[PDB]
Amino acid sequence: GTLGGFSKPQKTFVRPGGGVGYKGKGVWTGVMEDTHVQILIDGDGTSNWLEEIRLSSDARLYDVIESIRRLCDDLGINNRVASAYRGHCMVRLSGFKIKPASRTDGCPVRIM
Ligand SMILES: C[n+]1cn([C@@H]2O[C@H](COP(=O)(O)OP(=O)(O)OP(=O)(O)O)[C@@H](O)[C@H]2O)c2nc(N)[nH]c(=O)c21
Ligand code: NA
């Protein structure tokens, strides 16, 4: 179902010992469940996390969240970090679960 890729790849980097990781700002974009999606990502060299989710529509919201969770498993990206981004949302996503926008955990789910 999911189709997309990195419109802004994170930085690929080499760790001591030769391992290849990803860090810094990135953007993944594509279509999940008939919805255009942008996922803004950051990472510090030890983990990678969601900063914001941007959707073209909420018509398939909970299905899109499940597709985002599955993609984040493949990309090694968590939803445990409290993003500083706020505004333009009714809900945030935290641990891949929907929370009211009043909360501070996780990241906004912004319908554009
Ligand atoms: C570019 N990139 C690649 N990956 C990881 O590597 C998988 C393949 O990611 P990919 O489809 O972008 O292919 P590739 O990394 O080989 O890029 P190419 O060589 O130019 O064709 C992804 O499913 C992730 O596990 C990445 N994972 C993260 N977190 N961030 C990135 O920017 C990233
Ligand atoms: Na970290």
Swiss-Prot record:
<protein>
    <recommendedName>
        <fullName>RNA-directed RNA polymerase L</fullName>
    </recommendedName>
</protein>
<feature type="region of interest" description="Cap-binding">
    <location>
        <begin position="1"/>
        <end position="112"/>
    </location>
</feature>
<feature type="site" description="Interaction with the cap substrate">
    <location>
        <position position="6"/>
    </location>
</feature>
<comment type="subunit">
    <text>Homomultimer. Interacts with the glycoprotein N; this interaction allows efficient polymerase packaging into virus particles. Interacts with nucleoprotein N.</text>
</comment>
<feature type="site" description="Interaction with the cap substrate">
    <location>
        <position position="75"/>
    </location>
</feature>
<comment type="function">
    <text>RNA-dependent RNA polymerase, which is responsible for the replication and transcription of the viral RNA genome using antigenomic RNA as an intermediate. During transcription, synthesizes subgenomic RNAs and assures their capping by a cap-snatching mechanism, which involves the endonuclease activity cleaving the host capped pre-mRNAs. These short capped RNAs are then used as primers for viral transcription. The 3'-end of subgenomic mRNAs molecules are not polyadenylated. During replication, the polymerase binds the 5' and 3' vRNA extremities at distinct sites.</text>
</comment>
<feature type="site" description="Interaction with the cap substrate">
    <location>
        <position position="22"/>
    </location>
</feature>
<comment type="similarity">
    <text>Belongs to the Bunyavirales RNA polymerase family.</text>
</comment>
<feature type="site" description="Interaction with the cap substrate">
    <location>
        <position position="10"/>
    </location>
</feature>
